[PDB]
Amino acid sequence: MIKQRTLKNIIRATGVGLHSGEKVYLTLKPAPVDTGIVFSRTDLDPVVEIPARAENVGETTMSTTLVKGDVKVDTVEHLLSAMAGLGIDNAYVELSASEVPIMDGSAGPFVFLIQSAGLQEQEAAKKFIRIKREVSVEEGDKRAVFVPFDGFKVSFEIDFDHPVFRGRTQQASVDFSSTSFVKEVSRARTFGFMRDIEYLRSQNLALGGSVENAIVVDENRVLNEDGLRYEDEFVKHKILDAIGDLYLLGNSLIGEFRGFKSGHALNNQLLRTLIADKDAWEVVTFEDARTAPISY
Numbered sequence: 001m002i003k004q005r006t007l008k009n010i011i012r013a014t015g016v017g018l019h020s021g022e023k024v025y026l027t028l029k030p031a032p033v034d035t036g037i038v039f040s041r042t043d044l045d046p047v048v049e050i051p052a053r054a055e056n057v058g059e060t061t062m063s064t065t066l067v068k069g070d071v072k073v074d075t076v077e078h079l080l081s082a083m084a085g086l087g088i089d090n091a092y093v094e095l096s097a098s099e100v101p102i103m104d105g106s107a108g109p110f111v112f113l114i115q116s117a118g119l120q121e122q123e124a125a126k127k128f129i130r131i132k133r134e135v136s137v138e139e140g141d142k143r144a145v146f147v148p149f150d151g152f153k154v155s156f157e158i159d160f161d162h163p164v165f166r167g168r169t170q171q172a173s174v175d176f177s178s179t180s181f182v183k184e185v186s187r188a189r190t191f192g193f194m195r196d197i198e199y200l201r202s203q204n205l206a207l208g209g210s211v212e213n214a215i216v217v218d219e220n221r222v223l224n225e226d227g228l229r230y231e232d233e234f235v236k237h238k239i240l241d242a243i244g245d246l247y248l249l250g251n252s253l254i255g256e257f258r259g260f261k262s263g264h265a266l267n268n269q270l271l272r273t274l275i276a277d278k279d280a281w282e283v284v285t286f287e288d289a290r291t292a293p294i295s296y
């Protein structure tokens with residue numbers, strides 16, 4: 001059978017919150033079968049735990065935030081993307097502050113941590129959510145869709161008209177049958193338009209932002225001296241974001257995601273909309289891995 005997966009060891013890192021700018025301690029720990037991913041604010045007294053589930057998502061305007069009453073864990077999507085890409089079912093995530101460190105702006109550092117911790121197979125069947133019927137959500141010209149697919153595929157299109165984006169592909173369709181999440185998606189950095197970053201900083205926001213953890217573009221060019229890590233790094237980060245946001249389902253997907261100019265808000269709306277309709281999905285396991293449309 002395809003088994004559930006956790007970490008072999010506890011592993012740690014430090015960084016700053018993109019939004020808050022404050023130093024934060026991060027800890028990844030093994031967890032028992034059927035735990036899922038659980039975030040803990042270990043700085044609080046008592047310590048507050050928030051399961052990484054779609055229903056616990058609060059505001060999504062900037063990043064995906066988990067909320068439990070007045071306690072928040074901000075910017076979970078890049079770390080969760082790495083968890084999803086490496087097929088980590090169960091883990092504890094401890095934080096000394098209200099935001100996951102931005103690190104280098106991608107999922108790369110978290111892939112590195114998870115891999116360094118080691119992967120532990122557990123004696124329980126891994127559950128998958130299989131999309132049975134196409135489900136979609138919209139806001140204006142923005143659209144997020146689940147489509148039936150015998151495997152796991154993420155497709156995305158962005159549609160920026162700014163000169164800096166002219167001629168760029170602005171579209172990618174990743175079938176993970178033949179694409180490595182680690183090598184081809186995970187190191188895609190977050191990006192920001194100079195005007196938008198300036199507006200945030202003017203309000204004492206995005207205090208942790210720098211060229212060392214974000215691609216900065218103005219109307220016409222990429223400001224980072226070393227350019228891009230991937231030729232299509234922009235859309236690949238949108239795909240990265242989607243994979244992380246989607247993992248708040250609590251299980252790996254058998255199906256396709258299609259995003260069109262969408263972000264965290266529509267991603268979460270899509271999840272809640274899917275979950276509510278039980279004719280649109282089912283939970284499956286694989287007693288024989290060779291019969292599975294996916295592989296970890």
Ligand SMILES: C[C@@](O)(C(F)F)[C@H](NC(=O)c1ccc(C#CC#Cc2ccc(N)cc2)cc1)C(=O)NO
Binds near residue numbers: 064
């Ligand atoms: C990409 C995104 O919008 C998505 F939701 F689509 C979203 N990204 C952000 O919202 C975002 C917010 C702020 C920054 C920034 C910065 C800076 C700087 C700076 C400081 C000093 C100097 N000299 C130069 C640069 C970058 C990204 C995202 O990835 N969420 O997961």
Ligand SMILES: [Zn+2]
Binds near residue numbers: 162
């Ligand atoms: Zn423009």
Ligand SMILES: [Zn+2]
Binds near residue numbers: 077190237241
């Ligand atoms: Zn992102």
